Design the sequence.
């Protein structure tokens, strides 16, 4: 029944993208998170502490592959989101694949209460998308004129975001290779709404104790089976897993 | 940097214990938990739903190997703990290793408010240990006379349990191969107190959303590095990991 996993293959620069390729067509919502062994998403309020040697490799790759990075407004402020920096070689590979040189950032907010003075609009090569509700879209649009394209992502209720709508709105703009890196609330809603296609999860070899929240938070409770596509490791005992929805 | 993990070896009946052996001497506190990809310890309030094909294999093995199973009084009630059932072959292998035929159960409680009428004392081959505080030990001892050996596990504060003391009290009684299966509060305190030597964690290939709590709960925040001793898998995409403290 049980099989021992072992390192059978060293990954170099180029086999790595293959492992994390998006499907050749269709919208694909990929999440990339890190957590402790005991499910803590945070250490001292952020994720960067737990980050593996591999983790920044993988984190960067997934960004390189994404058409858009979708992020909750909470993570933007907390993780200090600025523009998606692509290095010269990253830009090259993106252009080679026919994508823009830098992935778009898309910020999800139900409230739309994004300060014009927010950090996220400032140090960036590209104006973010703001994914919000039909209700607040117009005001948000005017308030953020010149700083962000504001997109209504309501489905039926104009006062909330419909996550499948959100996904289709991004697809609608050719941003079908979607990466989300947080936060837990956002991820929680993707999970609740069953629109998460893939979870790339770094499991950091730490226990952090009970204080930390999980990589998903919120009222959602589901039981979505996923298929383990791969587990990578490094010498530091990290697991870089990639699971795709059944 | 990254290595692809793959199934290199089929585990049979007998190589499995080797992977999960306790050190030949010394006290060893091993936890065995299961969680979802997104760190949920529970589904609908229990853990059994997520359980792999492998998971009951491993769960049983770890029990077979343990001198004592330490459990919070919460898990006892919630998971419906009765006596540790060992099958005839399990008993045999335990005797072969010089252990009692059935592992002892040890219930941790600060309050000591264990009903004499509790389920845990009833359907069992062996009287449980009750690990509690110096303060309530005497009353708990009298109240549970005939049903459980009550052991004070205070260190300095007689009103709380000192987890290192708890471990030594079990060692003191020859129960040095310790398995805990919960709950999160208990595990949280083992983690807080840095007495957890090993975490065997089943990662079930599900996301469950934000409602679930983690396999550790409580106020504790630590950053304890662990070494990945092994990752096993099955066809169902479960990971049966074993991490030992650095
Ligand atoms: N371990 C990891 O991998 C990881 C990764 C990322 C973040 N984190 C951590 O998690 C924490 C942040 O948590 P968080 O839950 O507040 O982050 P968040 O999900 O990014 O932010 C929450 C806010 O974003 C908006 N939002 C999220 N989902 C939405 C939805 N479905 N529809 C409309 N708006 C939505 C809402 O904004 P409005 O209030 O404006 O409506 C919501 O209040 C930080 O500590 C961060 O470091 C950890
Ligand atoms: N996914 C998994 O692998 C897994 C495994 C096990 C359990 N669970 C789940 O977790 C839930 C139970 O959570 P829980 O935190 O209440 O379980 P718990 O830790 O077993 O029970 C908590 C209680 O046990 C006692 N306790 C725990 N740690 C103690 C300590 N260091 N010192 C003194 N007493 C201590 C206290 O009893 P007193 O109040 O009497 O002082 C405490 O209130 C259930 O839903 C269960 O299914 C999940």
Sequence:
């Amino acid at each position: 029944p049980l099989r021992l996993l072992s390192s059978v293959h060293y990954l170099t620069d180029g086999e790595l993208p293959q492992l994390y390729d998006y499907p050749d067509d269709g919208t694909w919502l990929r999440a990339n998170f890190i957590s402790s062994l005991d499910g803590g998403a945070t250490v001292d309020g952020t994720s960067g502490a737990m980050a593996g040697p591999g983790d920044r490799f993988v984190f960067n790759l997934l960004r390189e592959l994404a058409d858009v990075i979708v992020v909750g407004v909470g993570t933007v402020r907390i993780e200090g989101y600025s523009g998606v920096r692509m290095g010269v070689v990253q830009r090259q590979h993106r252009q080679a694949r026919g994508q823009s040189e830098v992935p778009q950032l898309a910020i999800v907010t139900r409230s739309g209460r994004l300060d014009r003075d927010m950090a996220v609009f400032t140090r960036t090569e590209m104006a973010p998308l703001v994914l919000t509700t039909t209700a607040v879209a117009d005001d948000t649009r005017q308030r953020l004129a010149g700083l962000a394209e504001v997109i209504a992502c309501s489905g039926d209720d104009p006062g909330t975001v419909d996550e499948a709508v959100l996904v289709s709105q991004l697809a609608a703009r050719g941003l079908r290779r979607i990466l989300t890196e947080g936060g837990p609330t956002l991820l929680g809603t993707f999970v609740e709404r069953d629109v998460l296609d893939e979870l790339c999860l770094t499991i950091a070899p730490y226990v952090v104790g009970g204080l930390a929240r999980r990589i998903v938070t919120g009222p959602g409770q589901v039981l979505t089976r996923m298929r383990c596509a791969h587990v990578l490791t490094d010498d530091s005992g990290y697991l870089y897993t990639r699971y795709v929805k059944t």
Remarks:
- The pocket of NAP (ligand 2) is lined by residues B 33-35, 41-42, 45-47, 71-75, 78-79, 108-111, 113, 161, 163, 181-186, 189, 215, 217 (CB under 6 Å).
